[PDB]
Ligand binder design. Structure first.
Ligand code: AG
Ligand code: AG
Ligand code: AG
Ligand code: AG
Ligand code: NI
Ligand code: NI
Ligand code: NI
Ligand code: NI
Ligand code: O
Ligand code: O
Lengths: 122, 570, 100, 570, 100, 100
């Protein structure tokens, strides 16, 4: 009974994040010469044009990582990440201006991605 | 993907079933529920979630369900519960307790808690958030008293005084229309909520009522002005008509009556009994029996809180200095021994623990400490856990029942007693955003940030010349809520309905928010949250022993308290 | 440090007491504010040491004598009052007629 | 009758060709010209020249070419020149730079610089006089920051914040109409000029524009809110319509783009690049290449200024504390090493010296020092003289060219960038009388007197109980310009044209002078006084080496600075 | 002297450090603000001596040990931060986990 | 104590002088505010001792020498002025060119 003022006594167990949502693993390569770090809640298809991956598999999704954390890609680095599904209304506005509406509009998102040179539109 | 509960609590603050120690006390609070959706927690910073198109909505204008301010991941401690939520503020009021962010991409977002372009962020992860403290026994003696109150989490001062005049140095009284007008104008410069008490003394209605019409928010009956049957009766007749609260400091000397005479004058009407234990004042020796009655809203002042080894020696001498007593006048020695009683101070600890005394208060600068109402509330709860054990009502090994009973004593119960709980006293939707953030290590000792009307008024913060604000010296400082005209929009002057209907704010040029006192005459003990017990309190006239349900109430004084020498430089 | 208003003010008393003690050490008879500062700081450091209010009410009457202070200073000080954090929290000490 | 030049300079301050050392630096400024008529110098005191019928005109009423205030014998240091003149002030503005006194008996009197009954005198003989500093990277976190700024000669604060909220602690942002209104009201109590930045974030125009209409003077794009292509584009569309400046802290993480992506979103529009070197924030590692572009107005923040032996150790740990980095998370270590770079901090010193970085600023309380913008400007110029030698442009062995290039970085250039150089930023006729007097021994370290709108606001002055004001303790103190209603007439709130046209000042009850932001969208690098260089800056992605015209920019860190341990008690 | 706002504030830290050191010298276990004041003043006097930021980041972890302070104080102090004028101007020192 | 505004301010000078003297005792050359604080406090403690204005105008020129202070500090201090309560009430002392 050493007292640490304000200390936690946390319950037993683990917290599952993004419970009940579909998970998807994809390979992503930083084709650029500068580091890219991606946060938990950016619409994955709208990341830096120099990240090469199957852009279709980023639509309606974000990184399956604890809220407020990031995946880092060093220059030239290729690695796998796990994605989860966006929730709420599944709409995205702004960011890279690829969606500005429902994430259901896959053709329109990919058409804009390809036109602006977001790498990996099949 | 899963996070263990230690890392989860480090990142976002604790979640359901996690416990947190209150400062260096033995008291543990447990998270009862959490409004979050695990994985969609809101947070602010580099690469974090509250960013445009992500946890921040880039579409909605301010009017379209967007907050002015989100407190992320708060551990709320309130009479309404001990639980985890985001707190949304707009137009200076709490508009949502729930889950903030962006409905575009997040599950479970409370519909009026959108983070948008218009939203400021305060990170409350790992903080305890409470309502601002409501101190209803304030003597306005020295303006330096306001920062003292703010530094210990007090946001409302109810009481009276004109500064260090003897009337004000003894009594919570701003007497008469002119003094009340002058102190309402002074109040324009005080960065805290204020309500002013008039003199509850007279044998005609008009001299008392004209104070209510001038802008007083209530009355104080004090023995120093004559706590006679007539002054008690006229004050309560005025209060019943005006819908304001009466506080009473009764006739200690029993000059015109004993306790039963004061209760007969009250005649079942509603009254706030100040320092009900009686060291601070009242019918010797049995005043504390007031706390048993259904029409009495009973408060303690703080120097008796809780009962310690130095209490009696300190109080006998404090009373000698306060009253100019002479040790060679036997009548002065008999008076002091009739008023300073270990039997009633010890019973006062247990009456708090049982929910029979409903409220705390300071008695700031008259016979009590402006910055120690919150501090001594938790010291008392800690002492009672050590001496009486967990309350029967407790579950899961937590002190949540005792923590709700005790937080009620300095938040919601004084607000209800004063007729101001529509505006302040709890973290509820629709109430004024007076919020206190605490590091658990400093809980009840030194507030981190005090929010007044949705803007920070006071903060423990460091070197103003530094690259970042955390370097030494970290001290209590007034913030932008106190500066310029913002002091008007972030604070409330509480006033009688009649003074408001008669246009006193416009007459005096008051720019502060005007709060209406109301719903004070139709309440009783049953309305005191978690502290609603009526009972026959017997105080033995010979031994001063206190009995409830045939059982003597006694406990030992303690040699040591938590929330003391670990924290304070003096 | 998290200094509150009183902790900042009371630093001043300790400082005035250090100044006064240096003045006593070079053989000056102490004046009114010097004497008050010395006895006040004594009380507050006593509380910090864990003494009782009763011990400090006795000891405070023996910190300075009339041969330590200027003519009239003993009669100017009716009492010295200080609040400090004891092990059992803030308490008030009054030292009555500290100098004879 | 002749005076030798040593006695002349002792009596009246230096004259043409005389040099003055700046504090304890190696930097010398030379008087380029003098407006006086030798023998008719103005001076004030017992038996001196500004007396009725003599150097003071006894005939003219105030309206008849008479000054409210004459600064006698000032050594002006300004982008417009380094020269000797009297400075005349009337209605709070500089109305004459030339020769003051009485045309009755004196030769060469500037016709609107009569000393009359209405004229106050400040003796500037032996003083250096500059414009007040314009700090365009202010976080409003702690009101104690204002005196810190005033004590080092800063008179305008542009930035954002609501006090020590996390949003404000990271970003120069007062978000949304309500926070902007509350901080305009707070501003009524701050004795310094202020302009407030809104949140430059959103994917719809209306949530951004409504901040401009509410009273914001500009916008801040910050990575912490999402420095995305959409937020950059919408902010600049709003700015082009509203005629206000946008500041940017870009996407350090390169999450949505690299530097070339941010520049494509900007699309040749005007933007202020904050902390362009990048330690304070931006595209890792090449953000500083922004400073080569003609549409970029580039500023440094001050902790990198200049490059010293403790800089890197201090900044790696500062970033760890600021960002809550963990030394056992390899991604955090890689991030810190990508952001804190000796190669770019060393090149930043030389880019200042070459006129490629146009502006200084603080980053007050977020990642920079409220009272060190002026101090570190001169430390940088001194280091560059030691390491690079006199600039080619110099003549007569003086540092006048380097002194004009460097004084421009914290006076006129931020004013031009913000759209406020019609009111402030230089000692020119027709501009607001924000003036700083310096003893040469204290130049850039501690201001003697700070004049705000023609009244002293802040002074290094001594014992207020003393016979004269020079006895100890001499310290920085607020003066009568800060007291009562005079704080309103001596300071400017800068606001958007739309907020002014919509009557926001009357709506909020603002009593301060209202300044109009304008002429911000039609400017570029070429408009930065003495700091107008566009060039291709190459930053090697592997080595972080910086090249301009095929030449690597590098210099050594210094172990010692002037304007440091000789002056400061801590 | 020409004191600026920070020079006036930082005098208070030196004073709190002098108070704390006297309390340590008479055998008291130091509390939270005392420990913070001692380590803060050490850093600022170190800068004045001309030490490097790196030297003070090391030394600050050895000014006080857990046997110098009350139960829980080591765990209450995550870090101590101070800005002072080094020979090369103002720099920030952070001492991480100063007391174990 | 009944401190007035000047008594509170002048406590700061004594404190800065104590800080400076500790810095001199560990072998530092003193800077501008340190030198001013030492000589100022000397004057005020001299008045308290009952010295004359004439004695302090002489003595103040011998408190510090150029070998006690940094390059340029002697030339930065033209004079040091202080008001203190002498036995015959408040008087002004100016020490001209205190350091050569
Ligand atoms: Ag009393
Ligand atoms: Ag009394
Ligand atoms: Ag930072
Ligand atoms: Ag950071
Ligand atoms: Ni009372
Ligand atoms: Ni009272
Ligand atoms: Ni930035
Ligand atoms: Ni910033
Ligand atoms: O009281
Ligand atoms: O920044």
């Amino acid at each position: 009974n050493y007292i640490v003022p304000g200390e936690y006594r946390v319950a037993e167990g683990e917290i599952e994040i993004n419970a009940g949502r579909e998970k998807t693993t994809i390979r992503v390569s930083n084709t650029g010469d500068r580091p890219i770090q991606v946060g938990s809640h950016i619409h994955f298809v709208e990341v830096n044009k120099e990240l090469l991956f199957d852009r279709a598999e980023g639509i309606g999704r974000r990184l399956n990582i604890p809220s407020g954390t990031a995946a880092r890609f060093e220059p030239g680095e290729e690695m796998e990440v796990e994605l989860t599904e966006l929730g709420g209304n599944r709409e995205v506005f702004g960011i890279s201006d690829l969606t500005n509406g429902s994430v259901d509009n896959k053709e329109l998102i990919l058409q804009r991605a390809k036109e602006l040179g977001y790498k990996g539109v099949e | 993907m899963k996070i263990n509960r230690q890392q989860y609590a480090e990142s976002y603050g604790p979640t359901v079933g996690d416990q947190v120690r209150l400062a260096d006390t033995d008291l543990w609070i447990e998270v009862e529920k959490d409004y979050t959706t695990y994985g969609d927690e809101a947070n602010f910073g580099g690469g974090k979630v509250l960013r445009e198109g992500m946890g921040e909505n880039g579409t909605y204008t301010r009017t379209e369900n967007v907050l002015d301010l989100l407190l992320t991941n708060a551990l709320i401690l309130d009479y309404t519960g001990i639980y985890k939520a985001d707190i949304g503020v707009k137009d200076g009021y709490i508009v949502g307790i729930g889950k903030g962010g962006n409905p575009d991409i997040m599950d479970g977002v409370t519909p009026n808690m959108i983070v948008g372009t218009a939203t400021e962020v305060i990170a409350a992860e790992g903080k305890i958030v409470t309502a601002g403290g409501i101190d209803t026994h304030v003597h306005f003696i020295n303006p330096d008293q306001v920062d003292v109150a703010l530094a210990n989490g007090i946001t409302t001062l109810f009481g009276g005084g004109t500064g260090p005049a003897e009337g004000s140095k003894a009594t919570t009284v701003t007497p008469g229309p002119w003094n009340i007008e002058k102190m309402l104008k002074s109040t324009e410069g005080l960065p805290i909520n204020v309500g002013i008490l008039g003199k509850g003394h007279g044998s005609s209605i008009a001299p008392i009522m004209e104070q209510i019409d001038a802008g007083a928010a209530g009355l104080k009956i004090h023995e120093d002005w004559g706590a006679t049957p007539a002054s008690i009766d006229r004050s309560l007749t005025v209060a019943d008509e005006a819908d304001v609260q009466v506080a009473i400091h009764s006739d200690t000397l029993n000059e015109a009556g004993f306790l039963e005479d004061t209760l007969r004058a009250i005649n079942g009407r509603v009254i706030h009994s100040f320092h009900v234990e009686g060291a601070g004042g009242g019918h010797a020796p049995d005043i504390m029996a007031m706390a048993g009655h259904p029409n009495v809203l009973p408060s303690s002042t703080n120097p008796t809180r809780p009962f310690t080894v130095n209490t009696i020696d300190e109080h006998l001498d404090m009373l000698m200095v306060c009253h100019h007593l002479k040790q060679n006048i036997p009548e002065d020695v008999a008076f002091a021994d009739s008023r300073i009683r270990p039997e009633t101070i010890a019973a006062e600890d247990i009456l708090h623990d049982l929910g029979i005394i409903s409220m705390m208060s300071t008695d700031a600068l008259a016979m009590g400490r402006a910055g120690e109402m919150v501090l001594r509330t938790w010291q008392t709860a800690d002492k009672m856990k050590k001496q009486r054990g967990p309350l029967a009502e407790e579950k899961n090994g937590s002190d949540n029942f005792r923590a709700k009973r005790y937080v009620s004593k300095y938040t919601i119960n004084p607000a209800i007693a004063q007729g101001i709980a529509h505006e302040v006293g709890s973290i509820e939707e629709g109430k004024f955003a007076d919020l206190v953030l605490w590091e658990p290590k400093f809980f009840g000792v030194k507030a981190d940030r005090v929010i007044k009307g949705g803007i920070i008024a006071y903060a423990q913060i460091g070197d103003p010349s530094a690259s970042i604000p955390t370097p030494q010296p970290v001290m209590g400082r007034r913030m932008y809520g106190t500066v310029g005209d913002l002091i008007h929009d972030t604070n409330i002057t509480f006033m009688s309905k009649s003074s408001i209907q008669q246009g006193v704010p416009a007459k005096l040029g008051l720019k502060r928010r005007i709060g209406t006192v109301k719903n004070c005459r139709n309440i009783g003990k049953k309305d005191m949250k978690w502290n609603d017990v009526t009972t026959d309190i017997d105080i033995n006239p010979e031994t001063y022993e206190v009995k409830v349900d045939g059982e003597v109430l006694t406990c030992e004084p303690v040699k040591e308290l938590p929330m003391a020498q670990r924290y304070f430089l003096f | 440090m998290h200094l509150n208003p009183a902790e900042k003010e009371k630093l001043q008393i300790f400082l005035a007491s250090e100044l006064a003690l240096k003045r006593k050490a070079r053989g000056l008879k102490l004046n009114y504010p010097e004497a008050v500062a010395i006895i006040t700081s004594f009380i507050m450091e006593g509380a910090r040491d864990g003494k009782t209010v009763a011990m400090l009410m006795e000891e405070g009457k023996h910190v300075l004598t009339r041969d330590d202070v200027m003519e009239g200073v003993p009669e100017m000080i009716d009492d010295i009052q200080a609040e400090a954090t004891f092990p059992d929290g803030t308490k008030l000490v009054t030292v009555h007629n500290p100098i004879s």
